[PDB]
Design a protein around this ligand. Structure first.
Ligand SMILES: CC1(C)S[C@@H]2[C@H](NC(=O)[C@H](N)c3ccccc3)C(=O)N2[C@H]1C(=O)O
Ligand SMILES: CC1(C)S[C@@H]2[C@H](NC(=O)[C@H](N)c3ccccc3)C(=O)N2[C@H]1C(=O)O
Ligand SMILES: CC1(C)S[C@@H]2[C@H](NC(=O)[C@H](N)c3ccccc3)C(=O)N2[C@H]1C(=O)O
Lengths: 333, 333, 333
């Protein structure tokens, strides 16, 4: 009783921003890529299932010369066990448990999910996490779920990609279309992170909440969160980098799914940093979004996504102000 | 109605050239590699199909240490739609539309296709191309086909791998075994390309024509083409590189397929550069080929390919003069 | 009649060593990874089969930034033919024929097989080998097998990963649970290897013998071997490296497979270098092992592996002394 899904996608994708667009939200140029992965589950007995998943990103916008590997990476690599109503346990490279909140609004055709950074403690995909998850409170309370996650230190060659040990968890409740969730995690920072000119403190923290409605072809969701010493930042001006002492982040999204296959989306996103050494208050992300995806079927879709960027040209970190539209065609299986 | 072919091959491959063979056509040593890819198509309705393909090259001739990734790359990554008799449109990393001509002679057991450079405008695989193709002139003229291709600028870290925007197209006609084709493309060069000591001008151009006969187990084909500011070149002597101001290229191939599985090949290829700054006229490629492939079945083959190199030892760019034989065994699926 | 097995695994894996553990046997931290590969065979006629295999290692313990490719590599890439009772021939990246002996004890849950180095002549996976193998002496003697292997020179950018040409072979005999094997190989060293401060001579050699019993849920095996100018070594102290002039290596392993799925293991391993320039005699590896693997089924397992390291703290090369325990969960297909 083993079942393995070999999956992936090819995505033709182009970003249009004015001129450079090194002063834009998303950049400009070919951004085509493919994904390949497997996910497997084995029925060990009537109450115990084992499972694993690996998922890799192949950029399609590099040449076949020296830059051939730019942006290629494993995204997910983990294995685990799931026992009857007791819960699941898995270990490896997986989603941070704060993403259990941030997923509510990470639903745009192309962009969105701006605060769910990779290799950033609990908010995105990260290496070396053991995660326990529970559905329906041990089978006792329909729609109530929770999880805890143990993050092992990863002392890497860059501050941006490092973390020390930490714990985080999430609780959510869903009932006939509605969902609420909260998530929090904290972890030590490493000395390389502490040595960064931007950001000061011994503990990174991240929390976020989410509300959503997800029924009758409607999707509305909001997330609000804060972080300390956790959101990574650069100042293009002095070329210094590190982490924002604080941030407050909101994301809203509303979307509708027509039966004939079109899926319009509108969204708002803002993330402001505070106490940034040498600057004070500064916006990191601030934009409105309109876009749509058109689904021909489960295997083929196309989409446009337009980012109406509200960052101004005088932003103190050198964050880009110009808009970006992305256009994509997706074959997947 | 989705169908995905997961495909690939393992290729044991060895090159024999005298001594180095840093002064040979193909080099010397282990050249083993594997390929993996998927190609999928989904029947969206009776007149519309979606499709995507990704294809990657894994070298098998690197160690497991620091050089482990040398020559690994995505070859193809694109997705598209094909509507009844109207045509197909796809975007991503795909073959240049000049390759629609150059494919006629790119048929040798191992070598050949010398002017179909990767990441070289329209002649080989390249990133960021939108390609439209038409079969049988909208369903109206059996055997008449055409295509146009829009190439977006790719300003990369090397001149050799860059291009500016351009358009190219191809028309071909096939009738009971015979085929003729022409293809042309032009594109801007980027300032990094223009700053190269070799090659001067604002526009790269490439064109090529092909004739072939391909029936009754016979395969005969010829290509003739020219290029301006498009064929990449190095002078080993001064270690300078860039692009040939002009070239003229011919390739011939003749082959026969025996029913018992052997496929002999003989071929001729010459590409001469002109107006090369500091040199004048110089051969880039000039060789005769004899070789064969033996097909045990659709999944297994073996081959030998011998390149009788006509480049002389006094060639002004430092192009190698010695011969090369390659031997290969191929399992594929 | 083609059959391709697409295979792989996801492995959540963590190493615990004290402090660093840069002075430990195995290190400390997340060591999660995945594997993907295919192996195919095609029935060409009733007596001839073609086959190929490729196998790749994706580390799951890197970030998605610049270090994303650390430790990723192709492990195997080869294709071949197998004719009735005559034998098999294959070429590409494959196991060294000395591994035909060293496999007997390379059976630990996580560690073990310490002398079977990658890209090290005949003892592990290596590029550019043509290998012939024979089963049951041409169909004439049940249980008697042999092989010869031709290794082509690989002059790489590092001494550690290079080899010159060489030949090696192996003979083994198996009868109702017992197995004996011997293997030997020799090859030239390259000038880059010869220029290393550690190791002196023109020929590398490696041999090893093995005994085992493998029936009735018991597994007991021993290997003894020697090497000249072949085992790679570093002195952390002066930061110099190269190859051990001589080594003598023993490995023992005993294991039992319970029907309910547990598989305890105990093992011993020691490898001592001799005539190391500037040092004399020095241990490379010296440890006891206890560990176990628990198999839920063919697709899921878990394991612990504890290495009781006997290298002392005064070891002259700077080889780590501290213990290491590894814990892993494995989903595979
Ligand atoms: C890989 C990321 C650039 S995506 C995420 C976030 N940004 C977005 O999500 C955003 N839609 C975006 C901006 C620019 C180009 C493309 C997409 C950011 O910064 N994180 C990075 C990370 O995870 O390391
Ligand atoms: C990858 C390429 C070396 S192959 C192509 C052309 N050369 C040949 O095709 C030729 N048969 C050949 C010569 C040497 C070794 C192996 C094969 C050339 O130059 N292009 C390069 C490119 O596309 O970047
Ligand atoms: C890839 C290797 C580190 S594994 C092999 C041998 N060591 C072991 O096998 C050992 N169990 C081990 C030690 C440390 C970490 C993990 C495992 C060694 O050294 N060879 C290297 C090679 O092949 O290049």
């Amino acid at each position: 009783g083993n079942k393995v899904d070999l999956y992936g996608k090819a995505v033709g994708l182009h970003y249009f921003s004015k001129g450079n667009g090194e002063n834009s939200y998303g950049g400009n140029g070919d951004m085509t890529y493919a994904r390949l992965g497997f996910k497997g589950e084995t029925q060990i007995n009537s109450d115990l299932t084992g499972y694993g998943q690996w998922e890799y990103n192949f950029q399609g916008n590099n040449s076949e010369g020296a830059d051939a590997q730019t942006g290629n990476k494993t995204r997910l690599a983990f294995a685990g066990l799931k026992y009857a109503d007791v819960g699941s346990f898995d270990y490896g490279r997986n989603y941070g448990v704060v993403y259990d909140a941030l997923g509510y609004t990470d639903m745009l055709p192309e962009f969105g999910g701006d605060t769910a950074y990779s290799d950033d403690f609990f908010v995105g995909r990260v290496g070396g996490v053991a995660t326990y998850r529970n559905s329906n409170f041990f089978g006792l309370v329909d729609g109530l779920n929770f999880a805890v996650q143990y993050l092992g230190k990863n002392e890497r060659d860059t501050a941006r990609r490092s973390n020390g040990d930490g714990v985080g968890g999430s609780i959510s409740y869903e009932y006939e279309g509605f969902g609420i969730v909260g998530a929090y995690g904290a972890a030590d920072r490493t000395n390389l992170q502490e040595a960064q000119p931007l950001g000061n403190g011994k503990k990174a923290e991240q929390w976020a909440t989410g509300l959503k409605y997800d029924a009758n072809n409607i999707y509305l969701a909001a997330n609000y969160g804060e972080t300390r010493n956790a959101t990574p930042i650069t100042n293009k001006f002095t070329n210094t980098s590190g982490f924002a002492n604080k941030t407050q982040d909101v994301l809203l999204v509303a979307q509708y799914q027509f039966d004939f296959g079109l899926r319009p989306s509108i969204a708002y996103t803002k993330s402001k940093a505070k106490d940034v050494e040498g600057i004070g208050d500064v916006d990191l992300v601030n934009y409105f979004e309109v876009g749509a995806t058109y689904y021909f079927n489960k295997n083929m879709s196309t989409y446009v996504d337009y980012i109406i960027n509200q960052i101004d040209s005088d932003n103190k970190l050198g964050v880009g102000s110009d808009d970006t539209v992305a256009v994509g065609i997706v074959y997947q299986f």
